[PDB]
Design a protein around this ligand. Structure first.
Ligand code: HEM
Ligand code: HEM
Ligand SMILES: C[C@H](O)[C@H](O)[C@@H]1CNc2nc(N)[nH]c(=O)c2N1
Ligand SMILES: C[C@H](O)[C@H](O)[C@@H]1CNc2nc(N)[nH]c(=O)c2N1
Ligand SMILES: Cc1ccnc(N)c1
Ligand SMILES: Cc1ccnc(N)c1
Lengths: 413, 413
């Protein structure tokens, strides 16, 4: 029937009846196969496609407040015919829009899903060349950045056909800093982008060897070899880090890009796959201040910000790490607010999600949620999300992870 | 074969081959049935008991560095005979000790398992009356408290026989503060102990209506009705809260008990069940400072500590909550350190667990771990535990949860 869910904070109880629509689970594994949709070298078998397709069409037409039965049956038949004759099918623009928001809505790891309906969709399904991808991406970056007043958007490239003509962005995020392996063993820049940075170099990119060198777009169109394009600097909006009290903060010369755009995920809908569909939202403080700046495997500025604060950086029990990270976080939020760039603190975000989750259970009795990802990287139990029991299931439409392209790509030249 | 585990912090990889020994899973559910071992009204069937028993005996004798084959086969036969003739079996003191440490070792939610071998065991298997339980408990509390130099210990009461003669402590923890539903709608004390507090009252306990009134021990022996006993005040060691800078802190009149003792869990071993086996360790800062003091459903002192600090307690984005909780945490650790009471900060604890987990994979290729419980309630990603992928599985021996006794107890008088 349903699964009982309790929020140990307010005490409220919820009944999940939505998980029954799940498809095909191991603790805290970051990249489980169940969340990945790999490559193919043959079209999607009709016996599988037709059912998913029909299923989707029913959902779309089942969303309207004022039912349009006639159109529904019509679309169903037309869709079927199209599959029989073509061996696949094209979604209507209206359907695609509905698909992107649903997939976002069904993203267990996203904390900003309250915005699920506010999303701009760029139809780049008629694209065909790398240069054309690059243009669409730039238009996206420019639209999303909106001079600091960030707007959520997604650019949908041509769906996978046979599997040998896949449109793919080799980057993890559109805007991302480079990571260089310095001469003297030490790393410089974003250590997380080490391997990919090398690739960019192997493809003739000019390594400017700096702390914040924006990586080039490595695009792949219609199954062809990837072409490298440098993002126009005028497009990449950044925020300089300043602390509202510690004037020595800016002396650290820190900064981060204001555009959080996922680039390497696949959009699944009605049996159709979209290997390239970069999407963006706006940042949440802790992402930059806690993960990007404080993770040891990233910029690791924690021990440095410690000394400058005059803390006992050699006595763990002094809770110096807790004190520091909070000021680094204050910096991020402050710097963004000052420079008029959209951003949301984790606390405000958490409440927002609770409101969303609550709205979801009413509207459809459920909300797929990965607790491990939803609870912020600092002050967990301080946020309401921590005390909320959640069920994590894969619905459809969905945004899947993909196998890194450079591992499965069969080179031409 | 094995399951690959990655620590995104250091990059290290681990191979889990221990999960194969698991027994009979839903996101962030706090009390899943898979973790609970309920009541019985009939003995444990021999067909099930004998295999588990044999299995356990093999483990125990399989731990010795210098194998004692003779004794092993002997114990096996003697154990079997004892089961055939008695319909159950008694563990040797040495075996019980081994069982308690293994069960602790196999506690997915415990972060202090590095201490798994340092545990004192009190054999109270020959107990028979409530008053006798009360005496054993006091001896435990006194031994564990050790004038602030906390010692880990466990008192094992008589194992379940038929199921109608169960030894049970109705308390969640040995030392626990009372929670009263005040006249003017407001709660007072520990809101979490509301329902149980009432029960104590229903049994004639004298409600002193205060913020920190230590609850009475509600003991149940040999399946009989529960008898109430008040813990001798001289036994309950407490710490007064003081901040190393804010002299106004002690003006809050806060304090907490120095003894973290689980009282209502069941010990499973070789097919045997121990419905009453209270155990204790020493506190970890965040337990008190973050959960006990800051949770809205507990003492909720966050908004209060905020004002006194002169923070913008009405502007979430100001990160006042983050600033406060850290000072409340500083207080706890400080107050404990000053008053010479054993305690460990979460950071030091996290590293400790990493060392343990690492030692476990070498010693036996695995370590059952509930990430959701292991990662501290504040500064998650700041601790190494956050970046460590973990597998959560139920081994044996194990410490299970039990159904609250007052719900399944058939009263006499
Ligand atoms: C509008 C503001 C938004 C905020 C504040 C937000 C925030 C977040 C955060 C904090 C994460 C975790 C990132 C990490 O730790 O790596 C995340 C993940 C994610 N977001 Fe949202 N998000 C927003 C919009 C969007 C949009 C518009 C979509 C899709 C159309 C979306 C899809 C996802 C997905 C699929 C993930 C998971 C990425 C992964 O698994 O690595 N988000 N988001
Ligand atoms: C010696 C120091 C120890 C420390 C610092 C420690 C710390 C912790 C912490 C932080 C928790 C989570 C508590 C909560 O959030 O409710 C916990 C849970 C637990 N601990 Fe340990 N522990 C220690 C010793 C022990 C011992 C000696 C045993 C058993 C013999 C043990 C068994 C467990 C179990 C089974 C849980 C889970 C309780 C539950 O599920 O509610 N711990 N411990
Ligand atoms: C819903 C969620 O499981 C719950 O609120 C949590 C999560 N992790 C926890 N972590 C610990 N150590 N103790 C807890 O009480 C909880 N509770
Ligand atoms: C191992 C663990 O899953 C991993 O380190 C985590 C946990 N939760 C997370 N939470 C978010 N939002 N993003 C992350 O990168 C991670 N990674
Ligand atoms: C899409 C997306 C991913 C990560 N963080 C965000 N804020 C948004
Ligand atoms: C046994 C136990 C339980 C909870 N916290 C601790 N520190 C110890």
């Amino acid at each position: 029937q349903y699964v009982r869910i309790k929020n140990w904070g307010s005490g409220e109880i919820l009944h999940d009846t939505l998980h029954h629509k799940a498809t095909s689970c191991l603790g805290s594994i970051m990249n489980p196969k169940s969340l990945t949709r790999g490559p193919r070298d043959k079209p999607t078998p009709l016996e599988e496609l037709l059912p998913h397709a029909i299923e989707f069409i029913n959902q779309y037409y089942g969303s309207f407040k004022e039912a349009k039965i006639e159109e529904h049956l019509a679309r169903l038949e037309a869709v079927t015919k199209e599959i029989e004759t073509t061996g696949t099918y094209q979604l209507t623009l209206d359907e695609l829009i509905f698909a992107t928001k649903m997939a976002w809505r069904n993203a267990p790891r996203c904390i900003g899903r309250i915005q699920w309906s506010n999303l701009q969709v760029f139809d780049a399904r008629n694209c065909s060349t790398a240069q054309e991808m690059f243009q669409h991406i730039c238009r996206h970056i420019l639209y999303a950045t909106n001079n600091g007043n960030i707007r959520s958007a997604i650019t949908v490239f041509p769906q996978r056909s046979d599997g040998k003509h896949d449109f793919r962005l080799w980057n993890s995020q559109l805007i991302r800093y480079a990571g260089y392996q310095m001469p003297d063993g030490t790393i410089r820049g974003d250590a997380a982008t080490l391997e990919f940075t090398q690739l960019c170099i192997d493809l003739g990119w000019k390594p400017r060897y700096g702390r914040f060198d924006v990586l080039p777009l490595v695009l792949q169109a219609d199954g062809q070899d990837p072409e490298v394009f440098e993002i126009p600097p005028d497009l990449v909006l950044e925020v300089t880090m300043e602390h509202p009290k510690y004037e020595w903060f800016q002396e650290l010369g820190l900064k981060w890009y204001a555009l959080p755009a996922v680039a390497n995920m696949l959009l699944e809908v009605g049996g159709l796959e979209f290997p390239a569909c970069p999407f963006n939202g706006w940042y949440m403080g802790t992402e930059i201040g806690v993960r990007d700046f404080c993770d040891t495997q990233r910029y690791n500025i924690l021990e440095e910000v410690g000394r400058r604060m005059g803390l006992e950086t050699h006595t763990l029990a002094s809770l110096w790490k807790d004190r520091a990270v909070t000021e680094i976080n204050v910096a991020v939020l402050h710097s963004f607010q000052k420079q008029n760039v959209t951003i949301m603190d984790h606390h405000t975000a958490s409440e927002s999600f609770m409101k969303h989750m609550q709205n979801e259970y009413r509207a459809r009795g459920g909300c797929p949620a990965d607790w491990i990802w939803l609870v912020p990287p600092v002050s967990g139990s301080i946020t309401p999300v921590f005390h909320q029991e959640m069920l994590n299931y894969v619905l459809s439409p969905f945004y899947y992870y993909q196998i890194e392209p450079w591992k499965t790509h069969i080179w031409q030249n």
